[PDB]
């Protein structure tokens, strides 16, 4: 298994999710 490539995509997923869900929270807070 490509463990290092999986770590990278993990960091990427967590970053996408923190950004997206963060802004989604902001959006509703200003709604």
């Amino acid at each position: 298994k490509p463990k290092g490539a999986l770590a990278v995509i993990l960091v990427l997923t967590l970053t996408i999710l923190v950004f997206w869900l963060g802004v989604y929270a902001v959006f509703f807070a200003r709604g």
Binding site: K3, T15, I16, V18, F19, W20
Partner: protein
């Protein structure tokens, strides 16, 4: 040089690269001042003492955007995506056309540059009507961009010649990238060519009284989305086909690389309403459709993330690294051609995360036209693309010129790329954060020092970024000039093969490669998608035009 007589394409490649890096240098001079500005520090008095022709923050921001994001990126794309496919095929580009594309770019540049420098087109790099720039800015810029139509013809010619010699062979990888990339660009470019020919040119010449701002923006963003993929793909061609060798490994999938590029050809253009989520008179169902297709255009970079990470992991394992992080430390961190794109790829993680937020329709109302946007795009173009081009100085330059890089020049390149990277990271934090605080983009905010009190903390990151990047830029200028003006020349460097990677062994899905090679077909699909995505809206706009007078507010 007997090298330039056999490979005249090295000299024309060099001219594109050098012109591009000169534009990057000049446009980037304004960057530190803009970063200090977003840190609430006004250094424009100093900038104007040094460059007395600069009349305003906004004139400097027009120059920065045009020179860095339009001129430099285009020149690099024309260097890379002509020269690399020509070397892979070992065939000569049509040199008459190559030269003509260069002279068009150079001439368009010089012509647009005159009103820009004279404060006659301080309309920014988006030039949105009714803001009305001098006719020479629109003409110079039109001729600059049309230079790329010649490049497209160059590469399609290479490919057709090769295919005629080699019927029933699939297109070689680098060539396949460049062909789909230039065809994508042709379809992409038609928005702006239309905006220019039907509206901007006749208007700035005095032939029509006004321009409808909504139709001009709609045609602009048809092109302005895919132009970003046009900046990005030449860095991707290096990252897929050259970087794996520089890292000490191999590209892990040729078919996955072709597939990413094929997704970019289909999805780069029909998506521009994601720049118009806040625009009146475009129907919301259409915005949602472009939002969905925008999230799809994310797929090829999501795919690229894994193909490339696995290639780098592979190289690190070849070089003795073990564990879950040992592969990272085993990579050639002493080589700037390796380090620059890798750091740019790391910043591209939060870069791409912001882009997926921006694409999300209603979420765009939180960030649109705020400092977040520049936060996102400095990760993508000013960091990934620019750093990948900077790292090319370290293999491409010697290959084009026979000029050797010394040990001392290699180390200074490492320092430049590290500081550039860290500066972009630090500024991304301050701008993302200031944008979440409603600080607007495109604003001389240091001139309203009490308007943004909540932003005091990200403002310190912007000041720090401005200083870090000033230092990176100065070292870059010193470095580029040292290798450019350098004493020695070893022609063997100009004659060594480009450092193209091998592809890892294992099959390779021929059914898929063959399907992907149906380039006429995929091109017609990409075109139909653009008719479907844009046709209905543009038929409604063009049948209800409302041209309005032009203004000069600077």
């Amino acid at each position: 040089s007997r090298v330039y007589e056999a490979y005249p394409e090295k000299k024309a490649t060099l001219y594109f690269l050098v012109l591009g890096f000169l534009a990057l240098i000049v446009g980037s001079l304004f960057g530190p001042f803009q970063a200090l500005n977003y840190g609430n520090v006004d250094a424009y008095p100093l900038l104007k003492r040094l460059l007395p022709f600069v009349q305003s923050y906004y004139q400097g921001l027009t120059l920065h955007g045009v020179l860095n994001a339009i001129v430099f990126t285009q020149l690099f794309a024309q260097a890379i995506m002509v020269y690399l496919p020509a070397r892979e095929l070992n065939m000569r580009p049509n040199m008459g056309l190559m030269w003509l594309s260069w002279w068009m770019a150079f001439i368009g540049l010089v012509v647009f540059a005159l009103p820009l420098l004279a404060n006659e087109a301080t309309v920014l790099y988006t030039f949105y009507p009714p803001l009305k720039g001098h006719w020479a800015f629109y003409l110079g810029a039109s001729v600059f961009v049309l230079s790329t139509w010649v490049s497209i013809y160059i590469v399609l010619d290479l490919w057709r010649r090769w295919k005629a010699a080699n019927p029933g062979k699939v297109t070689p990888l680098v060539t396949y990238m460049a062909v789909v990339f230039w065809l994508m660009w042709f379809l992409a470019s038609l928005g702006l060519v239309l905006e220019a020919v039907l509206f901007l040119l006749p208007w700035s010449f005095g032939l029509v009284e006004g321009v409808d701002p909504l139709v001009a923006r709609t045609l602009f963003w048809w092109t302005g989305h895919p132009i970003i993929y046009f900046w990005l793909l030449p860095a991707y061609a290096i990252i897929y086909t050259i970087l794996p060798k520089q890292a000490g490994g191999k590209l892990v999938s040729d078919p996955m690389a072709r597939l990413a590029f094929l997704l970019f050809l289909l999805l780069s253009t029909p998506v521009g309403f994601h720049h118009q989520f806040a625009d009146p008179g475009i129907d919301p169902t259409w915005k949602m459709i472009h939002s969905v297709l925008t999230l799809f255009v994310a797929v090829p970079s999501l795919m690229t993330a894994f193909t490339v990470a696995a290639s780098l992991e592979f190289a690190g394992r070849l070089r003795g690294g073990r564990g879950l992080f040992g592969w990272i430390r085993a990579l050639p961190w002493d080589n700037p051609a390796f380090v620059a794109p890798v750091l740019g790829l790391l910043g591209f993680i939060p870069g791409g995360a912001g882009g997926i937020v921006n694409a999300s329709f209603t979420l765009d109302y939180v960030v649109h036209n705020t400092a977040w946007v520049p936060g996102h795009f400095h990760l993508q173009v000013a960091s990934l693309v620019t750093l990948t081009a900077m790292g090319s100085l370290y293999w491409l330059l010697p290959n084009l010129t026979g000029k050797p890089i010394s040990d001392a020049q290699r180390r200074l390149g490492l320092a430049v790329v590290w500081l550039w990277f860290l500066g972009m990271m630090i500024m991304a934090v301050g701008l993302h954060w200031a944008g979440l605080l409603n600080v607007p983009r495109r604003a001389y905010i240091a001139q309203v020092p009490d308007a943004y009190p909540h932003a005091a903390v990200p403002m310190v990151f912007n000041v720090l970024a401005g200083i870090v990047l000033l230092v990176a830029l100065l070292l870059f200028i010193y470095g580029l000039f040292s290798v450019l003006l350098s004493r020695e020349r070893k022609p063997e460097l100009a004659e060594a093969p480009l450092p193209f990677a091998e592809v890892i062994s294992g099959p390779e899905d021929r059914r898929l490669v063959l399907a992907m090679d149906r380039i006429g077909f995929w091109f017609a699909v990409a075109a139909i998608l653009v008719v479907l995505a844009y046709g209905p809206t543009l038929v409604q706009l063009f049948g209800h035009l409302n041209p309005v007078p032009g203004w000069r507010l600077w």
